[PDB]
Nucleic acid binder design. Structure first.
Ligand SMILES: N[C@@H](Cc1c[nH]c2ccccc12)C(=O)O
Ligand SMILES: [Mg+2]
Ligand SMILES: [Mg+2]
Ligand SMILES: [Mg+2]
Ligand SMILES: [Mg+2]
Ligand SMILES: [Mg+2]
Ligand SMILES: [Mg+2]
Ligand SMILES: [Mg+2]
Ligand SMILES: [Mg+2]
Ligand SMILES: [Mg+2]
Ligand SMILES: [Mg+2]
Ligand SMILES: [Mg+2]
Ligand SMILES: [Mg+2]
Ligand SMILES: [Mg+2]
Ligand SMILES: [Mg+2]
Ligand SMILES: [Mg+2]
Ligand SMILES: [Mg+2]
Ligand SMILES: [Mg+2]
Ligand SMILES: [Mg+2]
Ligand SMILES: [Mg+2]
Ligand SMILES: [Mg+2]
Ligand SMILES: [Mg+2]
Ligand SMILES: [Mg+2]
Ligand SMILES: [Mg+2]
Ligand SMILES: [Mg+2]
Ligand SMILES: [Mg+2]
Ligand SMILES: [Mg+2]
Ligand SMILES: [Mg+2]
Ligand SMILES: [Mg+2]
Ligand SMILES: [Mg+2]
Lengths: 56, 150, 48, 110, 16, 142, 103, 117
RNA sequence: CGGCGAGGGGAGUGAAAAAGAACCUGAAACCGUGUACGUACAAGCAGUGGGAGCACGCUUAGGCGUGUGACUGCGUACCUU
RNA sequence: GAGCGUUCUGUAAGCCUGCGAAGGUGUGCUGUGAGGCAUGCUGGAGGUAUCAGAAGUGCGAAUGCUGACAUAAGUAACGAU
């Protein structure tokens, strides 16, 4: 079925009220390399909890 | 309008407002509804009304003193400079000069001054007589005008 | 007596009807033809 | 001193890019770069490129320091839309608006 | 053109 | 000059205490509704609450004339199908009498946010005690 | 003090030194106007109520301004009956300055 | 002579929309809905000039009634007393006094009671 | 800056880039960003009559003007037929 | 019955105008109305008094025509399990 009346910009905003993203609360610093990373994720260089887990 | 007489879409079932020709005056690039044609804009004036209008115009010109009567009005040679000097001598700028006989030298002299016109006796008209600021009558022109107006 | 000091006589130049140009003119919408019928149809009417 | 970087006719829709822009509006530039690094959106990639360009503008052209910069303004406007055809069932054609957007980032210290 | 449920006869002639 | 109107941050509201023992329900309720609306003040303004706070003691001892103690039926609907409920006056007194007084005054008050504010001003007690001795109510004879 | 009088079919309660807007009086721009029909004069618990006019009490005003009031639009509209009409209106007024109340 | 209608059309539509400034949504944006609102606003304004006169008389009656009942007489008997004592102070001024000068209204109530008695 | 991009910011020409090639002017619908006010116990052609408070300008320090509009009386769109 | 406005012709090789025209967007004044007048900002070269004259002369509706842009909606779907 299909609408009888055109919804407004007000109701469009009210429906999109819950569409907002949530940023990550805080990043992490590694105790060896010192690089910010997602928690429980290995860093960009390949460190995790102070151990080089992957080469390069 | 250039186009065909085909119905643009079938009468019923399309869901669109019905149309019967692409050349409809409603449509974009359609024809004009009441398109104008070459027509004759001229009006008839009775001869006695035309003569009464000229008599009233001449009487009003004499009443407001815009009509100067001179005995003779001519130039020696067709020189616009000479005519302009003679009119500045007479202290006239915007002038219709009627002359009893069509003079080639005067006509060629006044052809280039756009505020000065030179007319023969038989060719005066209400728009020119009303529009031009001063009108200069020669005596022969006065006689011819009074004769043709009776 | 100039070209912009001449005016016609009083009552000699009454302006024509302009049919269908809004409510206030008194000739809007139907334009003096009533409602429906052969006499309000375009080109309608009977012969003499 | 406000410094402006724009990316025009960005091949993305204004609504999604508005989600990301409203995510970073008002933060410091370092926090904003962390947020745009770890947001999983194509609009986040586009907005991060514009923001890094704005920071480099504020360095090179006006001498502003990174540690003082904040994202004063950010807004996404609707750009022109390319119109395409998607053929449907039973001979019907439907039109597809491949939307674009203009992403503007204004960074400053005050 | 036209919808098949408008061309159909059992549902168009629903209230004769 | 423009007609004076009461201002909601300037008006003074008093506190009264009214014994409902032996009064007639309707006439007591009309006088309460008038004093909650504030029709008794020269500074009355229709869009401004200007009434007085009224405490009603012994709400379980009101009187109704005729057979109204047994025949006056209160109806309501629970919003579910078949959910029409009724309760007579004596059942309403036996269960909760403050609601008898409160429906009478609520039906006599205007409808809307302002009438809701005036009904907020009305305080009804079933016994002959109140907690509002700190506000120092004056005895009102109705 | 204040005094209740009538002018232009309406009644006004005025004090000394006030500016009062009345209906258009046929008095020139800067003259004085003498109101004799005073309904009531109050003088701080000294009240005089006329039956119908207070005897010997008059109000003296100085005409300050003449003018036209703020415009209003009159709209008349009969729907589906093809009837619509509009009009404008500005009401003339006279500002006086009440400068004397004498009992 | 062909006439193009852009300038006049824009002027008329903008006149209506400037009148319809302040309304909700399409009533202040869209010309059609705005025109339907401005006409209704004019009709309501006319009808409410009349209703303003009625409403203000109603308010004055209520205030005179409250003050007279405070002074120990009903509104109807108070007005009967004034019309019998031939006092021509109208209801606007009487409500004004009833709010601002209670002593003068006490004097008026005493006059009306003396006229009835 | 960017992918030896797209796009942009400086510099420069020009009277003007509030004429940069998607280029004279640049309306409305439509979509945003900032500021002021209102709005999370409140029912309906969404206005109108009354109306407090708040914010900003004030030039008789007097109230006025502008924006909002809590509360409130009345109030079921336009065309056609 | 009486009028407002718009385009064009005459008055007009006149009058206003790069010390800023038309157009666009605000503000203030004014008329009983259609409307007029003044001015800030954008604009960047035309406009036109007054009295007459001619009409492709005034739009909200026609399941009206053409372009642009919303809505359902960041929803269904993304074409062989
Ligand atoms: N509905 C079926 C059959 C169908 C096709 N065309 C029709 C026209 C009228 C009625 C039914 C049909 C289909 O789409 O294939
Ligand atoms: Mg319907
Ligand atoms: Mg054509
Ligand atoms: Mg002939
Ligand atoms: Mg008629
Ligand atoms: Mg019929
Ligand atoms: Mg019809
Ligand atoms: Mg007929
Ligand atoms: Mg035909
Ligand atoms: Mg096919
Ligand atoms: Mg009611
Ligand atoms: Mg043209
Ligand atoms: Mg707007
Ligand atoms: Mg480049
Ligand atoms: Mg140019
Ligand atoms: Mg442009
Ligand atoms: Mg715009
Ligand atoms: Mg409740
Ligand atoms: Mg609330
Ligand atoms: Mg609701
Ligand atoms: Mg109602
Ligand atoms: Mg032009
Ligand atoms: Mg011209
Ligand atoms: Mg036309
Ligand atoms: Mg239109
Ligand atoms: Mg219509
Ligand atoms: Mg859905
Ligand atoms: Mg779903
Ligand atoms: Mg899916
Ligand atoms: Mg596939």
């Amino acid at each position: 079925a299909v609408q009888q009346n055109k919804p407004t910009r007000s109701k469009r905003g009210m429906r999109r009220s819950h569409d907002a993203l949530t940023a990550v609360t805080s990043l992490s610093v590694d105790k060896t390399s010192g690089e910010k990373h997602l928690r429980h994720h290995i860093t960009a260089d390949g460190y995790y909890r102070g151990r080089k887990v992957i080469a390069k | 309008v250039t186009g065909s007489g085909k119905k643009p879409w079938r009468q019923k079932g399309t869901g669109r407002a019905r149309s019967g020709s692409i050349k409809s005056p409603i449509w974009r690039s359609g024809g004009v509804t009441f398109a104008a044609r070459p027509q004759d804009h001229s009006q008839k004036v009775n001869k006695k009304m035309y003569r009464g209008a000229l008599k009233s115009i001449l009487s009003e010109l004499v009443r407001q003193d815009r009509l100067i009567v001179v005995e003779k009005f001519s130039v020696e040679a067709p020189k616009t400079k000479l005519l302009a000097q003679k009119l500045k001598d007479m202290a006239l700028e915007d002038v219709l000069i009627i002359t009893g006989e069509l003079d080639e030298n005067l006509f060629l002299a006044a052809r280039n001054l756009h505020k000065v016109d030179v007319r023969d006796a038989t060719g005066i008209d209400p728009v020119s007589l009303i529009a031009f600021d001063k009108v200069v009558m020669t005596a022969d022109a006065v006689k011819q005008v009074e004769e043709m107006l009776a | 007596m100039r070209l912009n000091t001449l005016s016609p006589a009083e009552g000699s130049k009454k302006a024509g009807k302009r049919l269908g140009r809004g409510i206030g003119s008194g000739l809007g919408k139907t334009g003096g033809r009533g409602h429906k019928g052969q006499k309000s149809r375009s080109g309608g009417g009977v012969r003499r | 001193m406000e410094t402006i970087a724009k990316h025009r006719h960005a091949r993305s829709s204004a609504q999604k890019v508005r989600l990301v822009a409203d995510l970073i509006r008002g933060k410091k530039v370092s926090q904003a770069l962390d947020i745009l690094t770890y947001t999983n959106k194509k609009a986040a990639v586009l907005v991060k490129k514009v923001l890094e360009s704005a920071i480099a503008n504020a360095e090179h052209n006006d001498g502003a320091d990174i540690d003082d910069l904040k994202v004063t303004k950010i807004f996404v406007d609707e750009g022109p839309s390319m119109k395409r055809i998607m053929p449907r069932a039973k001979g019907r054609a439907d039109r597809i608006l491949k939307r674009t957007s203009h992403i503007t980032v204004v960074v400053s210290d005050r | 053109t036209s919808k098949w449920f408008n061309i159909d006869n059992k549902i168009v002639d629903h209230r004769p | 000059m423009k007609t004076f109107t009461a201002k909601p941050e300037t008006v003074k509201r008093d506190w009264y205490v009214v014994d409902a023992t032996g009064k007639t329900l309707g006439r007591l309720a009309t006088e309460l509704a008038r004093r909650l609306r504030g029709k008794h003040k020269a500074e009355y303004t229709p869009h401004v609450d200007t009434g007085d706070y009224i405490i009603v003691l012994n709400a379980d001892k009101v009187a109704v004339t005729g057979n109204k103690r047994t025949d006056k039926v209160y109806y309501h609907h629970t919003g579910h199908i078949g959910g029409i409920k009724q309760a007579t006056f004596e059942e309403m007194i036996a269960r909760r009498p403050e609601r008898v007084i409160e429906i009478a005054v609520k039906g006599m008050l205007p409808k809307g946010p302002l009438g809701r504010a005036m009904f907020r001003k009305l305080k009804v007690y079933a016994g002959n005690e109140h907690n509002h001795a700190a506000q120092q109510p004056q005895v009102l004879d109705i | 003090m204040y005094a209740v009088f009538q002018s232009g079919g309406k009644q006004h309660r005025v004090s000394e030194g006030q500016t009062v807007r009345l209906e258009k009086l046929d008095i020139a721009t800067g003259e004085t106007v003498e109101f004799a029909e005073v309904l009531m004069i109050a003088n701080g618990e000294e009240v005089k109520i006329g039956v119908p006019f207070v005897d010997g009490g008059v109000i003296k005003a100085e005409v300050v301004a003449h003018g036209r009031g703020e415009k209003v639009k009159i709209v008349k509209f009969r729907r589906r009956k093809h009837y619509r009409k509009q009009q404008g209106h500005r009401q003339w007024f006279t500002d006086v300055k009440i400068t004397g109340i004498s009992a | 002579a062909r006439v193009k209608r852009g300038v006049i059309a824009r002027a008329r539509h903008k006149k209506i929309l400037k009148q319809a400034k302040g309304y909700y949504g399409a009533r202040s944006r869209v010309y059609r809905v705005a025109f339907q609102a401005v006409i209704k606003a004019g009709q309501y304004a006319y009808r409410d000039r009349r209703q303003r006169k009625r409403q203000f008389r109603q308010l004055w009656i209520a205030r005179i009634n409250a003050a007279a009942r405070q002074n120990g007489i009903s509104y109807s008997k108070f007005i009967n007393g004034l019309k019998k004592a031939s006092v021509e102070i109208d209801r606007k001024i009487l409500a004004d006094i009833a709010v601002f000068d209670k002593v003068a209204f006490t004097a008026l109530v005493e006059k009306a009671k003396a006229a009835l008695a």
